[PDB]
């Protein structure tokens, strides 16, 4: 993590230089802050420092929960992160609410949770074959599962309250994304308990593995249903969705492959 430490040190030095420049421009306490908030490049450097701190926190949390593993997990993280960044910015333009740093923070937190969900899926796929099974692995998995579930439930409840009170303007995107994340967490829990039952039973117990596949396909159906409902509401409210069309196609393709595999089997 030498490169991460170097990057965070560089960002900290840059923000310290910006703060020092502002302070030496206005010796008081209020005008320096108002100049920082009025000048654009200084606020941009502050945003970069905030993003770097978020990245450091994400690295710490990933080391605590999963721990390194530096593999296709990282490649999937990068690919889905680029896709999610494109989708998020698209959905942001989808509405006139530009800038709005609180909404930017909300989107960043959503991206944080989505990246952690993808890493959880990759760790589940690694666990299904031949992991370093121990007490700590189970503890990490259950702790991450409970944390993600609690946070997702709280945020979806807040989104439901917001859309009931204010309306379906921008909070519905968060609601649907966190609903998809809840489906992902349900799939993760099902896969983990199935693998635990398979491991604790010594014998392969294949009669349940097919059932696990059944559960998987059912969950996929649920997911695609949610997505199509999203599409419906997104054509009911505004003109035409643009941000989620590619994820819709991906979900449709995955469900089609799953149902074809189930039929041929």
């Amino acid at each position: 993590m030498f490169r991460t430490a170097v990057m965070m040190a560089a960002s900290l030095a840059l923000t310290g230089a910006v703060v020092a420049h502002a302070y030496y421009l206005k010796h008081q306490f209020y005008p320096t802050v108002v100049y920082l908030t009025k000048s654009s490049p200084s606020m941009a450097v502050l945003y970069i420092q905030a993003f770097v701190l978020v990245f450091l926190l994400g690295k710490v949390m990933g080391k605590v929960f999963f721990g390194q593993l530096r593999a296709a997990e990282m490649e999937h993280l990068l690919e889905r992160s680029w896709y999610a960044v494109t989708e998020t910015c698209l959905a942001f333009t989808v509405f006139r609410d530009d800038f709005s740093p609180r909404f930017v923070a909300l989107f960043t937190l959503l991206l944080f949770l989505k990246c952690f969900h993808w890493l959880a899926e990759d760790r589940v796929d690694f666990m299904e074959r031949s992991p370093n099974i121990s007490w700590l692995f189970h503890c990490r998995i259950v702790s991450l599962m409970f944390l993600l579930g609690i946070l997702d439930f709280l945020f979806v409840s807040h989104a439901y309250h917001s859309i009931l009170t204010r309306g379906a303007s921008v909070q519905l995107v968060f609601g649907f994304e966190y609903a998809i994340l809840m489906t992902m967490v349900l799939t993760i829990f099902i896969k983990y308990v199935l693998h635990s039952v398979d491991l604790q039973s010594e014998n392969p117990w294949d009669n349940k593995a097919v059932y696990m596949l059944y559960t998987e396909l059912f969950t996929g159906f649920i997911k695609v249903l949610l997505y199509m409902a999203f599409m419906t509401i997104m054509i009911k409210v505004h003109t035409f969705p643009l941000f989620a069309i590619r994820p819709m196609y991906l979900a449709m393709r995955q469900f089609k492959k799953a149902v074809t595999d189930a039929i041929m089997s």
Partner: protein, 523 residues
């Protein structure tokens, strides 16, 4: 100009007063010549011993503002009074401000009223015989604190765009450029030739204001275009044919003073009323003047007062002059001296010498801060608001090397105090800072608190409210109360949208301290 002043210096020293006075007032202010404070003092002393109004006024300024020779508010008063009695105007305005603000001499409204009335009468004659020059007042504190705004002077790109539009054929652009060149200012020097050319170009298209201003210029006369009463009358008639309020006012003036036609009061009254009904300031002023004087009508002071108020809201100096005269003499309205003095002061701050500010401003942008600070000290002796603030600011940042670096803060505090009494929020906040940190005077949290509170109450300054919240939180001057601090921070937040982040951070700090205290007291 430099070569002209070289000729003057060659003719100065020991021969004839005019060049001596000119070169002395150039040496003192550092403009058009290298500043020589001691040489200026010598010239002023020689002129005072021999006798001259301007030479005595300069020496009085030196003895009053502390430049060059040791300050003495007793001899400076003598020199100022002899300059005022000699027939000068700068001495008159300086003495008027000194009596109005209670500086140096005992406070009184009568003496300041007299001095400002004399200066206002002279400047009113000047603007009536010339037309008046629009003064562009720019203050360094707001420019430095807000560098992204456009100052009173128009940007060069905007001037180029306006000239391009005028050359393409835009009649309104031509009229605007002609008006700017005739009046001057806003980044454009006053030019009669360019204004005349633009008015001629716009008149060929059919613009009422074009021939209206052409007739006004012909009636008033100029060094370039010779005076022609017949041409002015023709242009006024042509403008008034299509319903131009400026042309109507010009034709009414011609009828009143018999320029081109005979003296007819009824037609002048009708044209003035027609011009006033269209919102034209000059027409309203003329109608109010003829109603107050009773020229052709009965002397009803109510309508004259209303028209003068409307013209003053329009921005005409003569309206303020007449209103101050009415308030001083008790004519039409009750005799109140304070309002008359204020109106006379606002009139006098529009004289020819008021242009010197720009020159001083120029010397501020040329890094020659000494001459800028001397010009600003002079124009702050006269009681300007912009000059006092600018001089205090320059003395504050220590860019002026003329004053002793162990005495910049006393004078800066003095000028901030003067600028606070004329209603300037920045001055009150800076006085609070000076008494807070320890600049100028010893450390005194009580006085800083008082000035901050006064600024917050009078002008509703967000930074004043934030500093009040800080003082209540830290327990400086007043008892340490957190609830009042929260109230003041909320008031600062609601008083301005830019105070969101600092108030939020200060409230976060206060909440952290409150939580720590709660944990300490609770088990």
């Amino acid at each position: 100009k430099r070569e002209a002043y070289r000729y003057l210096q060659k003719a100065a020293g020991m021969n004839h007063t005019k060049a001596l006075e000119r070169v002395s007032y150039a040496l003192l202010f550092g403009d058009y010549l290298t500043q020589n404070i001691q040489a200026a003092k010598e010239m002023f002393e020689k002129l005072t011993e021999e006798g001259s109004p301007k030479g005595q006024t300069g020496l009085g300024f030196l003895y009053a503002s502390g430049l060059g020779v040791n300050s003495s508010q007793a001899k400076a008063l003598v020199y100022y009074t002899f300059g005022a009695l000699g027939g000068n105007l700068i001495a008159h305005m300086i003495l008027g401000y000194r009596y109005w603000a209670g500086i140096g001499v005992l406070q009184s409204c009568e003496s300041a009223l007299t001095h400002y009335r004399l200066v206002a009468n002279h400047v009113a004659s000047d603007i009536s015989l010339t037309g008046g020059s629009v003064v562009q007042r720019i203050r360094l504190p707001d420019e430095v604190e807000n560098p992204g705004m456009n100052s009173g002077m128009l940007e060069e790109d905007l001037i180029q765009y306006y000239q391009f539009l005028a050359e393409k054929g835009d009649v309104q652009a031509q009229v605007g450029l002609g008006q700017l060149h005739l009046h001057g200012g806003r980044g454009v020097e006053q030019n009669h030739q360019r204004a005349f050319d633009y008015f001629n170009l716009a008149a060929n298209a059919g613009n009422s204001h074009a021939m209206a201003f052409l007739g006004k210029m012909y009636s008033e006369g100029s060094d370039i275009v010779p005076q022609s009463n017949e041409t002015a009358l023709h242009y006024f008639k042509k403008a008034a044919d299509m319903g131009n309020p400026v042309g109507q006012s010009g034709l009414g003036m011609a009828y009143l003073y018999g320029r081109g036609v005979q003296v007819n009061y009824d037609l002048a009254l009708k044209y003035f009323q027609k011009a006033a009904e269209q919102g034209w300031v000059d027409g309203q002023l003329q109608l109010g003047s003829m109603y107050y004087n009773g020229i052709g009508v009965k002397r009803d002071y109510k309508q004259a007062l209303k028209y003068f108020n409307l013209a003053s809201q329009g921005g005409h100096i003569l309206a303020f002059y007449n209103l101050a005269q009415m308030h001083a003499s008790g004519t039409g309205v009750m005799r109140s001296c304070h309002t008359a003095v204020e109106l006379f002061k606002n009139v006098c701050e529009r004289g020819r010498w008021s242009e010197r500010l720009m020159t001083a401003y120029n010397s501020y942008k040329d890094e020659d801060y000494n001459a800028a600070v001397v010009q600003y000290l002079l124009l702050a002796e006269q009681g300007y608001e912009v000059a006092q603030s600018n001089a205090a600011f320059i003395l504050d940042q220590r860019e002026a090397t003329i004053v002793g670096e162990n005495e910049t803060y006393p004078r800066a505090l003095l000028h901030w105090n003067r600028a606070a009494s004329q209603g300037y929020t920045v001055a009150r906040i800076k006085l609070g800072d000076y008494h807070f940190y320890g600049f100028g005077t010893d450390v005194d949290y009580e006085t800083a608190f008082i000035h901050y509170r006064l600024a917050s109450e009078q002008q509703h300054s967000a930074q004043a409210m934030f500093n009040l919240g800080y003082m209540h939180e830290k327990g400086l001057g007043i008892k340490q109360d957190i609830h009042l601090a929260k109230r003041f921070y909320d008031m600062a937040a609601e008083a301005s949208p830019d105070a969101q982040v600092p108030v939020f951070l200060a409230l976060c700090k206060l909440g952290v301290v409150y939580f720590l205290q709660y944990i300490r007291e609770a088990n």
